[PDB]
Amino acid sequence: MSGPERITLAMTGASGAQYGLRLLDCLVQEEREVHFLISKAAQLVMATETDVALPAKPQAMQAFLTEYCGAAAGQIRVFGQNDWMAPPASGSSAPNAMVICPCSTGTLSAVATGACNNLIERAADVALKERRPLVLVPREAPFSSIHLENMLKLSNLGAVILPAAPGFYHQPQSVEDLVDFVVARILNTLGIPQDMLPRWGEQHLVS
Amino acid sequence: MSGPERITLAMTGASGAQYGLRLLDCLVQEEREVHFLISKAAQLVMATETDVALPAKPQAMQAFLTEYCGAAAGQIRVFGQNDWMAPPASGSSAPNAMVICPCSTGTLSAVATGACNNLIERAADVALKERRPLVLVPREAPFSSIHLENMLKLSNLGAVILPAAPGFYHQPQSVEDLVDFVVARILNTLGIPQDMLPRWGEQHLVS
Amino acid sequence: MSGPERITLAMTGASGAQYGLRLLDCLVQEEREVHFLISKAAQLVMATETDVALPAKPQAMQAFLTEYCGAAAGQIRVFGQNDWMAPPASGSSAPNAMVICPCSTGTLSAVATGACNNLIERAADVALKERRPLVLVPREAPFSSIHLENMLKLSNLGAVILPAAPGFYHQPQSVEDLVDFVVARILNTLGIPQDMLPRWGEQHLVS
Amino acid sequence: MSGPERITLAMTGASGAQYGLRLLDCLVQEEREVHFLISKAAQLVMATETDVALPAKPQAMQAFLTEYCGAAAGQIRVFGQNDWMAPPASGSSAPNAMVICPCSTGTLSAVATGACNNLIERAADVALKERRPLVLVPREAPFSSIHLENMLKLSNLGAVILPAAPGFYHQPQSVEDLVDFVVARILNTLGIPQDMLPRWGEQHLVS
Amino acid sequence: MSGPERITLAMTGASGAQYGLRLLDCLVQEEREVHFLISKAAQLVMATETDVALPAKPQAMQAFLTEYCGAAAGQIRVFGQNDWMAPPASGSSAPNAMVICPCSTGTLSAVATGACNNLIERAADVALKERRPLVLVPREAPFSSIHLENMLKLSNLGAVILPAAPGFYHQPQSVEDLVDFVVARILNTLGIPQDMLPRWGEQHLVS
Amino acid sequence: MSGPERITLAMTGASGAQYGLRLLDCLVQEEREVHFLISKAAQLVMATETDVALPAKPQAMQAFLTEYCGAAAGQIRVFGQNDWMAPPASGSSAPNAMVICPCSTGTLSAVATGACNNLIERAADVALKERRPLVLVPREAPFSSIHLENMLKLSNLGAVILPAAPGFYHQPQSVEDLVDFVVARILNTLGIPQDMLPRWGEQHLVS
Amino acid sequence: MSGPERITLAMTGASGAQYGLRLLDCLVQEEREVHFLISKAAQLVMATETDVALPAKPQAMQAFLTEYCGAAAGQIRVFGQNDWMAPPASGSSAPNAMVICPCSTGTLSAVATGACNNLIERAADVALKERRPLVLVPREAPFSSIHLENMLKLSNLGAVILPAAPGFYHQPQSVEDLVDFVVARILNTLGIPQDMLPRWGEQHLVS
Amino acid sequence: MSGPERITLAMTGASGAQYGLRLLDCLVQEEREVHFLISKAAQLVMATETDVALPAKPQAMQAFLTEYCGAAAGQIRVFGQNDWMAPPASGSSAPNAMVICPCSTGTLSAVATGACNNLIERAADVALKERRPLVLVPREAPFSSIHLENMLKLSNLGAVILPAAPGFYHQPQSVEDLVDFVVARILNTLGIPQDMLPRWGEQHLVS
Ligand SMILES: Cc1cc2nc3c(=O)[nH]c(=O)nc-3n(C[C@H](O)[C@H](O)[C@H](O)COP(=O)(O)O)c2cc1C
Ligand SMILES: Cc1cc2nc3c(=O)[nH]c(=O)nc-3n(C[C@H](O)[C@H](O)[C@H](O)COP(=O)(O)O)c2cc1C
Ligand SMILES: Cc1cc2nc3c(=O)[nH]c(=O)nc-3n(C[C@H](O)[C@H](O)[C@H](O)COP(=O)(O)O)c2cc1C
Ligand SMILES: Cc1cc2nc3c(=O)[nH]c(=O)nc-3n(C[C@H](O)[C@H](O)[C@H](O)COP(=O)(O)O)c2cc1C
Ligand SMILES: Cc1cc2nc3c(=O)[nH]c(=O)nc-3n(C[C@H](O)[C@H](O)[C@H](O)COP(=O)(O)O)c2cc1C
Ligand SMILES: Cc1cc2nc3c(=O)[nH]c(=O)nc-3n(C[C@H](O)[C@H](O)[C@H](O)COP(=O)(O)O)c2cc1C
Ligand SMILES: Cc1cc2nc3c(=O)[nH]c(=O)nc-3n(C[C@H](O)[C@H](O)[C@H](O)COP(=O)(O)O)c2cc1C
Ligand SMILES: Cc1cc2nc3c(=O)[nH]c(=O)nc-3n(C[C@H](O)[C@H](O)[C@H](O)COP(=O)(O)O)c2cc1C
Ligand SMILES: CC(C)=CCOP(=O)(O)O
Ligand SMILES: CC(C)=CCOP(=O)(O)O
Ligand SMILES: CC(C)=CCOP(=O)(O)O
Ligand SMILES: CC(C)=CCOP(=O)(O)O
Ligand SMILES: CC(C)=CCOP(=O)(O)O
């Protein structure tokens, strides 16, 4: 397979819960193992913006997402916000790529400063120290200078800052097509196959 | 009226021509005077992403947009890319707010470095030196460190960096609802009334 | 009216609870709408330094402060520390000026780094990104280099750093006169009328 | 009225005393209240470059300028260089816009470093801390890196650096027309009406 | 006595709980007063890495540690994570040296940014502002650039960054000898006598 | 004795002359030798804010302060603003701690830039180069970025920035109790005994 | 002869075409060889601000300027904007001093960033790399922070930033006298004799 | 095979010679080719801290280490400190990963500054310029700001700073278990299999 076998997928409390659920679904369809983390605020976002009725506790959440996605037993792990016995908490874990989608400005801040206050933040700290892939998907507008400095610091350290800023150059017809644009770029970044977004100009030879 | 009487609206060659056309339409409906500039690349974007058949030359373009938007005679000015006799080229002009929507990474760069190679770039240079409003609406993903440094520099100088990163917390049902989210935030930034996006929590008293 | 119609007033756990209560009282007397937030540590400060017996929960706190201040029904809103449905949590809210009085070194830090861990910190993050007024009133001595760097960063971004450092040039006779000095400068900063502190030299013509 | 009711006008010892006297005259004609400060070196410049015989002491200077300008009694205040009882010395004063015209490199330095050695320098320090308008009009050539760093620091803090560098694009015919160009840009910066310099392109609709 | 009479000893959730317990034991044997703080994560580390069954609540923990160490009544104080009435929370307290051993990357971050979210972090903030000794003992590998920037900032402000990186130049024979190496260097840093690690070259006169 | 035998006490022209006079009184009561310096502006502040009728010339001022404070002959030295033969002007002098209380923004600037224009500024320059204690007590609000950069630079070089920002956590009942709070913190900083402000939590053992 | 034998004189599209034409005339009268470059925008400025009817193409322009200035055949070279075979394009050319007069903000930007988009910009890039004289004469007001950073960078690298900011201390009587002031300072900078501006104080011996 | 076929292993004169010998042994057992370099000071460390009697000259050292490790002929190359004909001296060499274990503060400095004074330092310079793996294993405590700046610079350039700071979370029972912890993390960093340190949480599915 091309790309990572295991992805840590963290959802934090920015608007755009649809992006994180669609990415989860694509990762599952690509037979990847997902270590799923979700913040309390992201739970409130998902309740507000979607009709997904996500259970609160990790085992119930795991059972629910496995069914929602059509996943295999064991394919989605769920870990709670203080579960330091989970693989993402240590750099001695097997290597995973990590994506924070969506990424709140508060989570962006914590990652940029090294605040390590829950498993999402620690997981990101471990990805950086181990030089494992780290993709942040912020959703905010305007971005203040606070936000921008935090994104620049992490981009300079090799994190990929991938704003939830979809393109329109494949004539999107629905909200889903815009969601899938962003998801496709995340999968592209990770080196995971996707067929939602064609390869630009692949068939163009000259002019 | 609340907000500026005159807006310089520059469209550059990032994906998201729909945002610039919808903002133009809203500004016209709010009885504002618009000084419209468009780059050659933005013309190619508009041809690719939309069914708007925009004429190439400024007078024909002006006639076309006046009709497209339902504007009054004289309400949309169009100026070509080297027209230094246009108001935006000089800080001795009457004051305008300026929005670059969408803003390509190349236009972002030119504004951040002071490159003054066409009227859009000069207009932005004048807005900064005169401390007149300047709003950039970049559409790109990932953002590299190049992009982020350019956005940070301009944000620190009082430009508003407003990525084309719509929210989902009003349960959007169509591409248009996402377009209108971004447009609403631009109008909010400018201090121009809009009723596309409600005032969050306006009716919430306690808890 | 001169100055903002709505002020977000956040009290955090620095010494100087008297300043925040007096400012609240002045804002109420000036017929402003106040969105009141208070941290858990600020509750402990208020219990230690004052004889105000503030209820713990937002609705009871709202009822209590409305009575304490002589406010109109609805004039003081109180929002709890995780209430993301409150106006201050979103930049799509109606615009407010925000004052953090007093501002702990920990809240100063969170605002400077963009940590967004409760509604006070998120509210400040939103004020900065929206270029809405943000006034911090730190109370600390000595200030370390940590403190000073955090204040400088925010001052450079247009926040007003207004230490709780009263002047003596109007011959204060009581603790209240010193409290009112600081409050007056906050109201001056906000553009709200006050008659506690005269306009210096207003009547001086020459020499 | 558009623009500030009160301007603090400080003349320092750069060449270009004509600019400061013409601005004073325009401000008076626009019915503004002027708080006038002049350095000892600026007195020597005025004696060298002009035929204005300015008295040395503040009351005599005030009487003289009131007559020279056709001002109303009380409209021009003059304050001496150590008069800390004057409004500009305190941020608790009524708000004024401040212009230093012309601005010597030494005054530029003092403002950039916060040196507070006379009332002009303190007044500028107060304008910055209160986020009241501050316009500096340097006259120097070449500018060294010392000069440029000082101007950049203050520009980054929201001061307007407006060099005495007139334009020629309205075909000036006299020294006075060049003086009036610079004065017009200062008044433009302050938001005060002026009809010396037309609004560029105001009548240009297309091309 | 040489060295401080009172040490604030904070244990945070890095691996190396043995270092903190051994330092506590040495401090007790040197008749020092210890103000002991421990984070929730450090409690989980101690449970995982050692057979010390530490009670959870401060009074029970105090009784337990007094017995474990052979301490005098009152010699070990224990304070909970929000106990702002404890001496370390205020710079008006009697002076203490502070050691964070072990120091997690998250606690390192909080100290470097001034986040003041529990008593350990506030205590460190107070040590820095009062220019009282502050020793951090990080245990992490690799160190990322996040970690290193945080350590550099604090080292530049006079904190001692003392990694849990034992030496081998006294031919250690056990895990305990390595633990005691690090502890000895902490005591050396604090100016407290120790005889675990000889003074290098003390008896070497020439060559 | 604990703390320095000799303190250079400089009063500059910020509001808060009461702080400097009370500190002088405490230092005298602690049998310290004081080298007293006062700026011309500080003389004007003392005349405005207090009923102390301080003579202008150093010998008369010395006689006056010796009486005002109950000092021993020779215990208060007074030196004029250009007296380079005074001990504070040279690092070859016997070592003193220096406190600038209150510290104007102009004196803060001069110390931060090394301007050495009077004996107070030179004395501070000498304290820094000799790594002798230097405590600045600024009184200003808001602090601008100018102020904050100057304070940060000096704090990074080991000066203590101690704003005149009293605490309220010992339930102050008078202006004097607030003055004494600040004075106590200065004496704490210097290592001089004081009993105005208790040691926080000294009697708290657990919880 | 004192000063350079060859000057590259580039005119760019800032207001102040009179300065560039007068400098050209003085250089010709001093028997210097001039390599003349002019941007398209500078052609539009010259048409607007002057009655010089400058031909568009380099050979016609050369013939025209030779006549306008009274120059010898071959004394004024003109090179077009993409003529890389011209001496200024290579550092292996014979050495020239270069002056950009007037210098637009866009040309200032290009030189500061190394953009090399036409022969003027490349010529400046070559002057810097060869440590040959480079004088920029900007004409703009206000200068923004963009402008100032670009000028500072180049000043730090040894370029001379000489704003078109004439002095008045030789009692100018006409627009020409102000033009000649600036020209004189450029010639002074280059080490070329001029008698338009006397040597200040040359005859002053004492006082 | 996973990971690099060739590792340049440099031992420098920090304490911790055991780490370098154990890593050498593991690399040999994993059938990797090792290019071994050792500094003169590291020879003195090995003599002091271990009972390995390492010959001084490269051929004798090679024979000795081949036997000590059970290596194949040709599997360990040894190169002397000025042998510029060795592969590590040139980026045109076949690619190797490089580890400096242990890394003295002096070698850390040389690598950070580009000092190229022996083959170890040149080899590291080549690894950085070729973007080949470079892992430094410093052993020092405290780390000064000198050390930390050097580590930060190299970490920012993509070197891995892996302090000799073992963890205790697998209940180490001997000095060897601590040595093997660090070695395992180096092998993890390099992508070489190891079974000394389990993959954290690999078997944890939920909670
Ligand atoms: C409905 C809703 C939408 C939100 N949208 C955003 C958003 O788009 N971006 C953002 O940075 N925060 C947003 N927030 C706020 C955060 O959720 C808040 O700052 C929180 O502290 C983030 O915490 P977390 O990073 O632990 O998830 C939203 C909150 C809610 C309830
Ligand atoms: C269909 C199309 C879509 C594009 N989308 C983007 C985009 O989303 N962001 C971007 O920075 N550039 C985009 N580009 C590229 C630019 O248009 C290109 O870099 C151009 O030089 C911008 O020039 P301008 O700033 O003068 O408009 C796009 C180009 C085309 C043709
Ligand atoms: C009585 C009392 C007084 C305090 N005084 C201060 C103070 O003056 N400045 C400060 O930064 N923290 C002070 N603190 C500490 C904070 O309250 C503490 O650092 C807390 O974490 C701040 O949290 P908050 O920012 O969420 O309110 C005080 C605490 C108490 C209990
Ligand atoms: C006739 C004359 C012209 C001057 N022209 C300038 C000038 O153009 N720019 C400048 O920075 N200083 C000029 N100076 C010098 C200053 O006046 C001098 O540096 C002085 O210290 C400025 O002090 P001030 O800032 O208190 O006015 C001039 C002085 C005189 C006497
Ligand atoms: C068994 C165990 C070992 C840990 N080892 C480390 C470590 O060596 N370094 C580290 O920075 N964090 C380590 N952590 C993680 C932290 O404990 C986590 O990031 C936590 O948020 C730190 O919180 P604290 O600073 O409040 O103690 C470990 C956690 C556990 C459970
Ligand atoms: C009554 C009075 C009160 C003042 N209060 C302050 C103040 O609180 N802070 C300040 O920086 N300057 C204050 N100033 C201004 C200064 O005294 C002024 O900037 C002066 O140049 C300081 O000079 P010095 O540093 O030599 O004492 C005050 C002046 C007077 C007359
Ligand atoms: C009449 C006229 C006057 C101008 N005045 C200025 C000016 O004073 N300063 C400036 O930076 N640009 C001025 N401009 C704008 C520039 O000419 C424009 O930004 C252009 O892109 C500069 O290109 P160039 O650097 O290749 O000459 C002026 C333009 C015209 C037409
Ligand atoms: C026994 C011994 C132990 C040493 N331990 C260390 C150490 O732990 N860290 C360190 O930086 N230097 C240590 N040094 C010092 C260095 O070896 C010394 O600074 C040397 O110049 C390093 O040179 P190199 O980098 O060429 O190996 C030690 C030296 C000896 C003899
Ligand atoms: C949860 C845990 C074992 C953290 C330690 O991991 P690492 O050694 O810091 O990568
Ligand atoms: C097009 C034109 C007149 C540019 C000059 O404007 P400004 O004086 O630089 O603001
Ligand atoms: C609570 C909420 C709707 C946060 C999103 O606000 P914004 O779009 O980030 O200004
Ligand atoms: C002259 C005077 C009262 C200075 C104090 O003003 P502010 O409180 O520093 O703004
Ligand atoms: C817990 C408490 C009294 C904090 C205030 O201490 P300090 O005045 O900030 O050193």
Ligand SMILES: CC(C)=CCOP(=O)(O)O
């Ligand atoms: C007044 C005097 C002797 C200044 C010289 O002191 P130092 O040698 O600069 O410390």
Ligand SMILES: CC(C)=CCOP(=O)(O)O
């Ligand atoms: C036009 C040309 C030969 C450019 C190369 O010049 P140089 O070697 O870069 O100074």
Ligand SMILES: CC(C)=CCOP(=O)(O)O
């Ligand atoms: C020892 C040698 C051939 C050094 C040159 O290598 P490279 O071309 O600098 O990578």
Ligand SMILES: [K+]
């Ligand atoms: K959470």
Ligand SMILES: [K+]
């Ligand atoms: K174009």
Ligand SMILES: [K+]
């Ligand atoms: K709270």
Ligand SMILES: [K+]
């Ligand atoms: K003066």
Ligand SMILES: [K+]
């Ligand atoms: K805790």
Ligand SMILES: [K+]
């Ligand atoms: K003085």
Ligand SMILES: [K+]
């Ligand atoms: K051109």
Ligand SMILES: [K+]
């Ligand atoms: K060597």
